[PDB]
Amino acid sequence: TTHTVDAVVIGAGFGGIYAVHKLHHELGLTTVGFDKADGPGGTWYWNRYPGALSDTESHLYRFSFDRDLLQESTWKTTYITQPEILEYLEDVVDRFDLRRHFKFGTEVTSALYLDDENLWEVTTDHGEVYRAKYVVNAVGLLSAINFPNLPGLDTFEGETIHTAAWPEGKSLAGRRVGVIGTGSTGQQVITSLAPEVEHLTVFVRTPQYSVPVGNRPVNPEQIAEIKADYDRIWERAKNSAVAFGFEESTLPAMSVSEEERNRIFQEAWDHGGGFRFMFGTFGDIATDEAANEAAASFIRAKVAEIIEDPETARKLMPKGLFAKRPLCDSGYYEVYNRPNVEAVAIKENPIREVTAKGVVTEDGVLHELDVLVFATGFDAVDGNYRRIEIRGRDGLHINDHWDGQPTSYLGVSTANFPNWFMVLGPNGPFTNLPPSIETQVEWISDTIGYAERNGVRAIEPTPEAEAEWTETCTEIANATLFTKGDSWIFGANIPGKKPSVLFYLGGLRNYRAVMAEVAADGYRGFEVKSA
Numbered sequence: 001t002t003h004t005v006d007a008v009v010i011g012a013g014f015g016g017i018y019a020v021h022k023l024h025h026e027l028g029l030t031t032v033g034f035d036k037a038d039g040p041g042g043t044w045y046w047n048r049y050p051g052a053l054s055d056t057e058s059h060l061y062r063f064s065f066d067r068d069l070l071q072e073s074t075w076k077t078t079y080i081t082q083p084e085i086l087e088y089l090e091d092v093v094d095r096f097d098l099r100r101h102f103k104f105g106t107e108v109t110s111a112l113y114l115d116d117e118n119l120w121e122v123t124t125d126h127g128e129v130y131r132a133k134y135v136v137n138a139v140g141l142l143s144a145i146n147f148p149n150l151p152g153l154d155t156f157e158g159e160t161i162h163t164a165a166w167p168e169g170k171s172l173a174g175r176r177v178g179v180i181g182t183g184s185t186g187q188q189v190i191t192s193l194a195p196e197v198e199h200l201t202v203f204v205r206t207p208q209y210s211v212p213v214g215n216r217p218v219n220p221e222q223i224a225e226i227k228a229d230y231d232r233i234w235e236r237a238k239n240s241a242v243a244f245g246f247e248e249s250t251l252p253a254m255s256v257s258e259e260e261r262n263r264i265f266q267e268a269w270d271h272g273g274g275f276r277f278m279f280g281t282f283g284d285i286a287t288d289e290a291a292n293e294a295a296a297s298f299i300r301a302k303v304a305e306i307i308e309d310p311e312t313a314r315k316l317m318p319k320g321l322f323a324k325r326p327l328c329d330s331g332y333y334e335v336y337n338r339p340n341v342e343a344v345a346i347k348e349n350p351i352r353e354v355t356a357k358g359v360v361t362e363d364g365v366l367h368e369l370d371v372l373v374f375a376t377g378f379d380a381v382d383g384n385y386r387r388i389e390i391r392g393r394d395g396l397h398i399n400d401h402w403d404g405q406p407t408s409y410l411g412v413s414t415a416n417f418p419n420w421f422m423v424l425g426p427n428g429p430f431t432n433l434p435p436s437i438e439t440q441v442e443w444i445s446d447t448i449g450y451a452e453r454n455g456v457r458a459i460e461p462t463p464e465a466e467a468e469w470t471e472t473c474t475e476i477a478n479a480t481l482f483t484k485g486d487s488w489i490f491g492a493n494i495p496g497k498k499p500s501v502l503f504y505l506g507g508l509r510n511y512r513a514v515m516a517e518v519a520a521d522g523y524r525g526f527e528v529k530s531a
């Protein structure tokens with residue numbers, strides 16, 4: 001009653017979808033994919049919150065591997081909403097006959113290596129067991145929900161929603177709603193909620209820096225232009241650092257005139273785009289403290305220009321390093337001018353407890369709500385690995401293997417875990433993610449086909465190669481400001497999670513070259529157990 005398969009894929013987002021296509025169609029392997037989700041989509045299945053939008057531009061937030069698909073797909077606007085991405089991924093699944101290969105509504109709860117037979121034994125929450133030669137983990141770097149336990153929470157008589165588990169069709173129009181969190185998710189859901197809702201209470205702990213998204217309609221002339229030049233657009237993207245489709249600046253910020261610097265930021269501001277403001281503006285906003293301060297200072301002044309009430313402005317003024325994930329919005333600061341929206345500064349004025357009726361802050365004020373929305377983010381990157389029973393050689397648990405910081409070789413493998421691969425695992429690229437996912441999935445499929453064609457029973461990186469990769473990512477990370485940014489990117493967002501590097505910050509171009517060259521070099525750093 002245990003099922004023998006060549007490959008197990010975990011996840012039905014961009015990663016899993018593509019892994020199943022590659023392993024089944026190109027490699028000719030029996031392949032089973034799993035997701036707890038009732039359908040494919042990953043991020044775009046789960047994040048049904050109002051205002052959910054990509055901030056990779058429409059034409060870049062998709063697969064590139066199928067040139068005809070690129071000519072076929074269409075979009076409304078310069079950025080693309082959750083339902084449109086969801087519809088795009090569903091179509092990819094239909095397009096390549098992938099749906100039959102997935103088990104939806106099914107969580108993998110265990111994956112144990114069997115040393116004697118060189119197989120993985122995988123168990124689901126339903127009690128089915130699979131034996132597989134390969135495991136591809138496409139489990140998401142931003143899917144393990146972080147849901148802080150506030151005092152008194154289970155006392156709340158109203159509805160509780162995490163944004164990354166928003167129920168389909170759930171509308172909060174006409175309700176009294178509080179939001180916890182003002183990262184990329186909070187800004188989007190706040191902006192969307194405010195006109196529809198009776199009252200919106202925002203519990204803001206750290207106000208953030210955000211530029212306009214500049215999400216504009218696209219006419220058939222506009223999509224045409226893009227599509228006719230799609231080959232060159234993708235080559236530029238795959239030859240850049242972050243692949244968002246603007247040219248990345250090398251120009252130091254303090255090298256230029258005080259006025260042009262202002263004009264450059266202003267033209268970036270009016271154009272829109274979060275990554276463009278940080279990197280298509282000057283080449284050292286992320287690397288030079290004065291350059292970063294100039295950027296930060298520019299945004300701060302817009303905030304003081306937007307928010308009318310001096311007190312509300314003070315509470316929402318972003319402070320400190322402009323060194324979290326770059327943000328952009330469709331009118332976020334504007335909403336705090338609306339009479340129905342209330343800002344609560346929870347650093348000055350902490351939450352005392354949640355009650356039946358709402359949230360009491362330490363000033364002793366009850367904030368009456370009947371819905372609480374958690375835009376509190378994720379245990380990022382490693383989170384979904386640590387929540388599962390995964391054991392490699394000699395029963396070594398993932399959590400004992402990664403007893404300190406989580407590690408990889410090349411973002412895609414780890415020692416003592418043979419034939420077990422990761423898509424967007426620890427210490428991989430920090431970019432517009434689809435083309436990074438494509439790079440990793442393609443590389444994993446090539447190494448699996450290699451192993452199949454040769455006599456290979458097990459392939460895993462050496463401890464030395466992994467540690468050298470840790471050192472390479474650490475060196476690169478020290479050269480940027482993200483590390484002093486105090487956010488999820490360096491695992492600083494959950495008390496109890498140890499902070500560390502979690503990304504290779506070299507960019508897509510340098511990453512692709514590393515990946516190409518390790519393969520061209522006979523999988524340098526891997527040990528290969530033959531038949």
Ligand SMILES: Cc1cc2nc3c(=O)[nH]c(=O)nc-3n(C[C@H](O)[C@H](O)[C@H](O)COP(=O)(O)OP(=O)(O)OC[C@H]3O[C@@H](n4cnc5c(N)ncnc54)[C@H](O)[C@@H]3O)c2cc1C
Binds near residue numbers: 035037042056061424
């Ligand atoms: C709101 C939001 C907006 C974003 N916007 C952008 C953007 O504009 N540009 C960009 O580049 N990136 C963006 N991202 C990041 C986004 O995660 C990626 O672009 C991409 O969708 C990741 O795809 P994935 O397949 O690797 O992971 P996911 O899409 O997260 O898929 C992982 C899947 O694995 C499943 N899973 C995990 N563990 C198990 C298990 N044990 N058993 C069964 N199933 C399991 C999960 O349920 C999930 O469906 C955004 C993320 C969010 C949350």
Ligand SMILES: NC(=O)c1ccc[n+]([C@@H]2O[C@H](COP(=O)([O-])OP(=O)(O)OC[C@H]3O[C@@H](n4cnc5c(N)ncnc54)[C@H](OP(=O)(O)O)[C@@H]3O)[C@@H](O)[C@H]2O)c1
Binds near residue numbers: 206
């Ligand atoms: N492209 C897009 O449009 C898009 C949209 C959504 C998400 N994303 C991706 O997902 C990443 C995560 O974004 P996110 O906004 O979902 O999560 P996030 O960036 O980690 O932000 C979470 C918010 O919740 C707050 N918070 C955490 N714990 C809290 C607690 N105990 N009490 C009160 N507040 C608490 C945080 O405050 P502190 O800052 O004080 O710690 C923060 O403001 C983003 O950086 C982005 O890369 C992208």
